[PDB]
From a paper:
Rhomboid intramembrane proteases are evolutionarily conserved proteins with numerous important biological functions, including growth factor secretion, regulation of mitochondrial dynamics, and membrane protein quality control (Fleig et al., 2012). Rhomboids are serine proteases with a Ser-His catalytic dyad (Wang et al., 2006), and they recognize their transmembrane substrates in a two-tier process. It is assumed that first a portion of the transmembrane domain of the substrate docks into an intramembrane interaction site of rhomboid within the plane of the lipid bilayer, upon which a linear segment of the substrate (possibly generated by local unfolding of the top of the substrate's transmembrane helix) interacts with the water-exposed active site (reviewed in Strisovsky, 2016a, Strisovsky, 2013).
To gain insight into these preferences and their possible interactions, we have generated tetra- and pentapeptidyl chloromethylketones (CMK or cmk henceforth) harboring amino acids preferred in positions P5 to P1 by the [name] rhomboid [name] ([name] henceforth), using the sequence background of the Providencia TatA (Stevenson et al., 2007), represented by the parent compound Ac-IATA-cmk. The interactions of the residues in the P4, P3, and P2 positions with the enzyme are structurally independent, explaining why the effects of substitutions in these positions are additive. The overall binding mode of both compounds into the rhomboid active site is similar to the binding mode of peptide aldehyde Ac-VRMA-cho (Cho et al., 2016). Collectively, these data show that rhomboid subsite preferences are additive in the context of an active site targeted inhibitor and that sequence optimization in this region can significantly increase the inhibitory potency of the compounds.
Numbering used by the authors:
A (entry chain B): 2 to 6
B (entry chain A): 92 to 270
Write the structure that this text describes.
Amino acid sequence: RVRHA
Amino acid sequence: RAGPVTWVMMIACVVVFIAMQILGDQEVMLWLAWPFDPTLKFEFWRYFTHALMHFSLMHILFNLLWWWYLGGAVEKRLGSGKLIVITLISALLSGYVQQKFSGPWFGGLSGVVYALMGYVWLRGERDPQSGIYLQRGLIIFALIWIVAGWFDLFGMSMANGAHIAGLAVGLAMAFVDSL
Ligand SMILES: [Cl-]
């Protein structure tokens, strides 16, 4: 799932 | 207290985070993510609004803490306009580098935060007369935070492109502003 900045 | 730019960013991030709990992360991402289909290429806001989405409580809290502190200080010492430009440049470039490495499904204010870290530190180091600097304890805390992202020390998939591009941007702008 999504990548976190 | 926090000036108008520092404040409106914090409010924006909380509004988006609430929308994400109500509508789901996926629905908000359809509206705010970096363009993920050629049909979305002219929806200009998307090149920046990825910075407003957060996926975990930890993620939003630490980004907003750093933003409140470093953004608040940049805005107080150097003005609202300066903070706006750092923010736009870091959001755009961090997003560009991220999507290049790993595609468009990312979010968070950390590209911008990492820019502020590098900016405030290098500007204090190269140009003490500005009246802004990153104090020792915060240098250490910032370094640990960076190290943790790079070596994936959160239990989360990181946008490493966004983070490194962010830090680069901040250091680059500090260098430019210290001439
Ligand atoms: Cl405040």
